[PDB]
Amino acid sequence: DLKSLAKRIYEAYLKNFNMNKVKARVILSGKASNNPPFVIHDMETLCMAEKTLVAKLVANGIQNKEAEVRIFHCCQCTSVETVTELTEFAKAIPGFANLDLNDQVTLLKYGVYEAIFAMLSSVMNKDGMLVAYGNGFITREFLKSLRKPFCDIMEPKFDFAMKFNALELDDSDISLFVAAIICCGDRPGLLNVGHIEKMQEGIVHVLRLHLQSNHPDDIFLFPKLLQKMADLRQLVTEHAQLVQIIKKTESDAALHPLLQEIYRDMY
């Protein structure tokens, strides 16, 4: 029964996310054959990568804009796609589809970015992150090179990811972790907190059992992951504040309407 739950969540994860850790680590390891990632480490390579990966935009003249504005809009596009995937994943979580329609929206509103930065670790190593469906690799140092405030976007997530990747979780662990993130009983605005906590309790229960079987060498792995969930909520809170800064101080860098709605009245 509980392994049913764990397998259903794992299978929904493998099915709904176009990029997962095993596939990411292959690309990140320099392995693979055709269509390897284009490395984006300075202005020259960013322009080259854009001419191949976003041809229509280049024809619209985006390369007249600041590199920081293109990178930010690239980030937004990835976020919209990942929110779409997480929304479908959550539907595959047992019990979620039975919740009130307003509570589903609320759980995903507060959960998506915590889950996003958790799973972002999977496509990060100490030197950069995968982008563009595995076809680009943008270096950590190039991102640090951007003018403020855009140089402050990615680095706190690199810092989180290096410590998160140190736990050596696999997709079977991560799928349960993300399920636990979404089914969070203390989100603001929740109508039926009681059903969500019962849903949360069952998922975390399976997580605890799964980590017991999958990581018998890490005595405190379960409470370490509880702490990472708190760490992610703080990271998202801070991230929403930097995005709000960029929204008002930085013109040319408008916010997408799906993401705008996520941050509205969030924190």
Ligand X SMILES: Cc1cccc(Nc2cc(Cl)nc(SCC(=O)O)n2)c1C
Binding region for ligand X (CB under 6 A): 40, 46, 49-50, 53-54, 57, 62, 65, 69-71, 73-79, 82, 116, 120, 131-132, 136, 138, 153-154, 157, 243, 259
User: In the complex, which residue's CB is closest to ligand X?
Assistant: 79
Q: How far is the CB of 174 from ligand X (least distance, A)?
A: 13
Whether 110 has a binding-site annotation, put simply, is no
Q: Report, in Å, the least distance between residue 205 CB and ligand X.
A: 28
In 179-233, at which residue ranges do the beta strands (DSSP E only) sit?
none
Of 192 and 260, which CB lies nearer to ligand X in the complex structure? 260
Which lies closer to ligand X via its Cβ, residue 40 or residue 203? 40
The residues, any chain, with a CB within 8 Å of residue 126's CB and separated by 6 or more, are: 140, 158, 162
Spatial contact of 155 and 238, defined as CB atoms under 8 Å apart: no
CB of 186 to ligand X, least distance (A): 23
At its nearest, how many Å lie between ligand X and the CB of residue 233? 15
Residue 134's CB is within 10 A of a number of other CB atoms, namely: 19
The CA–CA distances, whole Å, from 99 to 122, 156, 227 equal 29, 33, 26
Query: Is residue 79 a known part of a binding site?
Result: yes
Nearer to ligand X, 203 or 262 (CB): 262
Which residue carries 């958790």 as its tokens?
Answer: 118
The three-state secondary structure class of 125 is: strand
Q: At what angle do helices 101-120 and 171-182 cross, to 10 degrees?
A: 140
Distance CA 2, CA 6 (A): 6
59: number of Cβ within 10 Å: 10
State the nearest-atom distance from the C-beta of 75 to ligand X, in Å: 3
> Given the complex with ligand X, which of 197 and 250 has the nearer CB atom?
250
Q: Tokens 């259903």 — which residue? A: 8
Residue whose CB is less far from ligand X, 181 or 243: 243
Q: Is 263 annotated as a binding residue?
A: yes
**Which residue ranges are tagged as binding site?**
79, 113, 263
Q: Residues forming the annotated binding site for indeglitazar?
A: 79, 113, 263
